[PDB]
Amino acid sequence: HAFWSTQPVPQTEDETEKIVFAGPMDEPKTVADIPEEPYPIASTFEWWTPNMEAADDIHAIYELLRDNYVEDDDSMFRFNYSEEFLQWALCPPNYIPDWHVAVRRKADKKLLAFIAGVPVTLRMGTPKYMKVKAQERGEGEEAAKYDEPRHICEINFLCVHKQLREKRLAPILIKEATRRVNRTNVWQAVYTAGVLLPTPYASGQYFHRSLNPEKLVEIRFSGIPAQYQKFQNPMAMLKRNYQLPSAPKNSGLREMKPSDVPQVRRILMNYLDSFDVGPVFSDAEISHYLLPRDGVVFTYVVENDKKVTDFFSFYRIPSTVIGNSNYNLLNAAYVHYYAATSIPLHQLILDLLIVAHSRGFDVCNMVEILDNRSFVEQLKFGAGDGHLRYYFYNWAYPKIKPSQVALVML
């Protein structure tokens, strides 16, 4: 690892396994110690900070990701994050525009690479159980040192043009992004990836709940499981197995609206503070991340006797179906944040599935963070072949189960 061997991250699993306290990797620094000038690059390339209040700029990023962002190992599906989605994801309250870092070609101003950082406030102190192991050694003082939430950077949408792959461009992007974050006096970041890098503090497998199995089989996202072949019409029985009620079972379920924001913030933060790693949200950020938004984020509440008691949200990311004969797009819903006080979690997520299905989604996707693992079987989710790995930059963190992670990454 010619690049990651130089960075302040735990370098191996044997080393992450032997970590028992949260805290930084690198000795302190100041803004003064960080270069003022952007890092140098090829003569035909320049750095470009896009303006996310301008549809031209958003459009140029959209096209780069649409054609060059994450594909599956078979090159059959590729994320097609929408423009509305990108403006939502990249511009939460207090976002910093200088954290959105691009390289374009001088000659024709063509977008060639991208990486985005947005600020988040994250609890990232010693996990509860490692703290118990610590209170026993009288080391409680060290274990609790970094328990207060920290304002850090969340990195996403790293992307290099297919025609420029393997020219060490991503390390220059990563470094220039680090620089700009450091000049802002931020020293930690959180990020996720489907690939193994040095070194995750958690990993969760992906799970999928089929909503339109016929289409999913047609485009070869899924197949017909062998035991359906004992039927005269396997596809009919597969559809029956995945069939859903026509409308929600929970009366009192309604779309979220702005007046709901403080009660949703209350119940969410009670649920989220249960977990070792989880975000801390103000009313503004709750509003930004949960309030319905057409084609992007969908959020519903259970109102019992005037009070909000439960809620769920999901977000939409279609994927390009790469050269298919009947289909352009896979329409996928992704379980977002949620909270249950009045009903079992699986009864609440069953209404998420019913709503997603009625709004035309083909599949419901999730990672086994939060308590997602606990309803996989009750709700006929299938296990996928990929995992999402959680990483910290410049933060030593003990290994934890994904069910102790509460940060949903877009």
Ligand X SMILES: CCCCCCCCCCCCCC(=O)SCCNC(=O)CCNC(=O)[C@H](O)C(C)(C)COP(=O)(O)OP(=O)(O)OC[C@H]1O[C@@H](n2cnc3c(N)ncnc32)[C@H](O)[C@@H]1OP(=O)(O)O
Count of residues binding ligand X (CB under 6 A)?
Answer: 36
Indicate which residue of 211, 272, 407, 410 is catalytic: 410
Which residues, other chains included, contact 209 with Cβ-Cβ below 8 Å and sequence gap of 6+? Answer: 353, 363, 364, 365, 379, 380, 381, 382
Interface with ligand X includes 41 (CB under 6 A)?
no
297/4 Cα distance (integer angstroms): 35
Binding residue for ligand X, selected from 90, 130, 177, 301, defined by CB under 6 A: 177
Interface with ligand X includes 64 (CB under 6 A)?
no
Nearer to ligand X, 179 or 359 (CB): 179
Which residues does a gap of C–N over 2.5 Å follow in the chain? none
In which region does residue 23 sit, left (phi positive, over 0), alpha (psi from -120 to 50) or beta (all else)? left
Q: Residue 79 Cβ, how far from ligand X at the closest point, in Å?
A: 8
- Only segment of 1-9, 203-211, 216-224, 303-311 that touches ligand X (CB under 6 A): 1-9
Hey, what are 291's tokens? 């309030």
Judge whether 164 counts as a catalytic residue: no
Binding residue for ligand X, selected from 102, 181, 216, 349, defined by CB under 6 A: 181
Q: Residue 194 Cβ, how far from ligand X at the closest point, in Å?
A: 7
- Only segment of 129-137, 138-146, 184-192, 254-262 that touches ligand X (CB under 6 A): 184-192
Residue with tokens 């409308």: 247
Query: Cα-Cα-Cα-Cα dihedral of 258, 262, 265, 270, to 10°?
Result: -150
Interface with ligand X includes 39 (CB under 6 A)?
no
Which residues, other chains included, contact 224 with Cβ-Cβ below 8 Å and sequence gap of 6+? Answer: 217, 234, 235, 238
Q: Enumerate residues 193-232 that contact ligand X by CB under 6 A.
A: 193, 195, 197
Q: Residue 9 Cβ, how far from ligand X at the closest point, in Å?
A: 8
Interface with ligand X includes 103 (CB under 6 A)?
no
Q: Residue 66 Cβ, how far from ligand X at the closest point, in Å?
A: 12
396/201 Cα distance (integer angstroms): 9
- Only segment of 51-59, 179-187, 241-249, 361-369 that touches ligand X (CB under 6 A): 179-187
Which residues, other chains included, contact 287 with Cβ-Cβ below 8 Å and sequence gap of 6+? Answer: 258, 261
- Only segment of 56-64, 156-164, 312-320, 367-375 that touches ligand X (CB under 6 A): 156-164
Interface with ligand X includes 159 (CB under 6 A)?
yes
Q: Residue 215 half-sphere exposure, CB side, CA atoms within 13 Å?
A: 16
239/215 Cα distance (integer angstroms): 11
Interface with ligand X includes 168 (CB under 6 A)?
yes
404/273 Cα distance (integer angstroms): 10
Q: Residue 134 Cβ, how far from ligand X at the closest point, in Å?
A: 26
Nearer to ligand X, 41 or 269 (CB): 41
69/323 Cα distance (integer angstroms): 16
Q: Residue 383 half-sphere exposure, CB side, CA atoms within 13 Å?
A: 7
Q: Residue 110 Cβ, how far from ligand X at the closest point, in Å?
A: 16
Interface with ligand X includes 31 (CB under 6 A)?
no
Q: Residue 264 Cβ, how far from ligand X at the closest point, in Å?
A: 28
Q: Enumerate residues 365-394 that contact ligand X by CB under 6 A.
A: 393-394
In the three-class reduction of DSSP (H, G, I as helix; E, B as strand; rest coil), residue 121 is classed as strand
- Only segment of 177-185, 202-210, 212-220, 356-364 that touches ligand X (CB under 6 A): 177-185
Q: What residues does 335 pair with on adjacent strands?
A: 314
Which residues form the interface with ligand X (CB under 6 A)?
1-4, 68-70, 153, 155-160, 165-171, 174, 177-178, 181-182, 186-189, 191, 193, 195, 197, 393-394
Enumerate the active-site residues: 410
